[PDB]
Design an enzyme around this catalytic site. Structure first.
Site, PDB file in Angstrom:
ATOM      1  N   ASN A   1       8.089  -7.223  -1.537  1.00  0.00           N
ATOM      2  CA  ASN A   1       6.636  -7.184  -1.690  1.00  0.00           C
ATOM      3  C   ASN A   1       6.160  -5.740  -1.893  1.00  0.00           C
ATOM      4  OD1 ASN A   1       3.727  -8.139   0.324  1.00  0.00           O
ATOM      5  ND2 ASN A   1       4.054  -8.183  -1.904  1.00  0.00           N
TER       6      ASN A   1
ATOM      7  N   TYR B   1      -8.809  -6.038  -4.141  1.00  0.00           N
ATOM      8  CA  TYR B   1      -8.156  -6.230  -2.855  1.00  0.00           C
ATOM      9  C   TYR B   1      -8.755  -5.304  -1.816  1.00  0.00           C
ATOM     10  CZ  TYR B   1      -4.281  -5.567   0.550  1.00  0.00           C
ATOM     11  OH  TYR B   1      -3.537  -5.441   1.700  1.00  0.00           O
TER      12      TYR B   1
ATOM     13  N   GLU C   1      -0.161  -6.324  -7.365  1.00  0.00           N
ATOM     14  CA  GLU C   1       0.815  -6.735  -6.366  1.00  0.00           C
ATOM     15  C   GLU C   1       1.984  -7.458  -7.016  1.00  0.00           C
ATOM     16  OE1 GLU C   1      -0.824  -8.696  -2.960  1.00  0.00           O
ATOM     17  OE2 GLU C   1       1.133  -9.423  -2.265  1.00  0.00           O
TER      18      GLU C   1
ATOM     19  N   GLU D   1      -7.706  -9.722   5.309  1.00  0.00           N
ATOM     20  CA  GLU D   1      -7.191  -9.134   4.078  1.00  0.00           C
ATOM     21  C   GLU D   1      -7.751 -10.069   3.012  1.00  0.00           C
ATOM     22  OE1 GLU D   1      -2.946  -9.783   3.307  1.00  0.00           O
ATOM     23  OE2 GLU D   1      -2.797  -7.708   2.593  1.00  0.00           O
TER      24      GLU D   1
ATOM     25  N   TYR E   1      -8.705 -11.092  -1.278  1.00  0.00           N
ATOM     26  CA  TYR E   1      -8.359 -11.004  -2.689  1.00  0.00           C
ATOM     27  C   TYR E   1      -9.356 -11.671  -3.626  1.00  0.00           C
ATOM     28  CZ  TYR E   1      -3.358 -10.184  -1.405  1.00  0.00           C
ATOM     29  OH  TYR E   1      -2.156  -9.722  -0.923  1.00  0.00           O
TER      30      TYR E   1
END
Length: 199
Positions: free
Chosen positions: A43, A81, A180, A90, A92
């Site tokens: 990741n 983000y 990402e 978190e 998105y």
């Protein structure tokens, strides 16, 4: 260029390269522009944006006009983000992606923002990396129904759309334009990342 976890500020923009494992490279340019490439990763996230430390309800209207050369070769996202604290979240706003449209959860509905259709989702992360260390927190998502790699995102409109469906935010820590990747390789070149904030 950056090849290991790193963060800072350049030309007024916050920037960060984050990854758990893998080969990553990032180069930051002026006006929030940046290039990145990744391979053999688990990741990795590459992003530039602005910090806030302010309740989302008082930010007024925040619009991000971006443009990107996005070339993922597998699982990846091109997105707005950021993070919220109290509660720790978190979030998105996915504009484009690789082979898989995120995030693999039950849709909480669709909304039309900035001319695009987005599905809203809530997910949960247990004991994962975060801005405050290993933690458990939820993620809020707006995922476009079709891919886009340039345009304007009225971030605060998504915040409202999420709020109206029970996904509450607190103090916004940061809002960024991010690339990402997940167990894949790829390259991207963000050529525009302009922020506009009015009330």
């Amino acid at each position: 260029a950056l090849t290991s976890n790193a963060s800072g500020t350049f030309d007024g923009y916050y920037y960060e390269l984050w990854k758990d494992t893998g080969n990553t490279t990032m180069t930051v340019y002026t006006q929030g522009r940046f290039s990145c490439q990744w391979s053999n990763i688990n990741n990795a996230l590459f992003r530039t944006g602005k910090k806030y430390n302010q309740n989302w309800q008082s930010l007024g209207t925040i619009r991000i006009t971006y443009s990107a050369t996005y070339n993922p070769n597998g699982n990846s996202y091109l997105c707005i983000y950021g993070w919220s604290t109290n509660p720790l979240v978190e979030f998105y706003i996915v504009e484009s992606w690789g082979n898989w449209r995120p995030p693999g959860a039950t849709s909480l509905g669709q909304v039309t923002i900035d001319g695009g259709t987005y599905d809203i989702y809530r997910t949960t992360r247990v004991n994962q990396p975060s801005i405050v260390g290993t933690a458990t927190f939820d993620q809020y998502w707006s995922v476009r129904t079709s891919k886009r790699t340039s345009g304007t995102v009225t971030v605060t409109d998504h915040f409202r759309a999420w709020a109206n469906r029970g996904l509450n935010l607190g103090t916004i820590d940061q809002i960024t334009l991010c690339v990402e990747g997940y167990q894949s390789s790829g390259s991207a070149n963000i050529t525009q990342n302009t922020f506009s904030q009015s009330s």
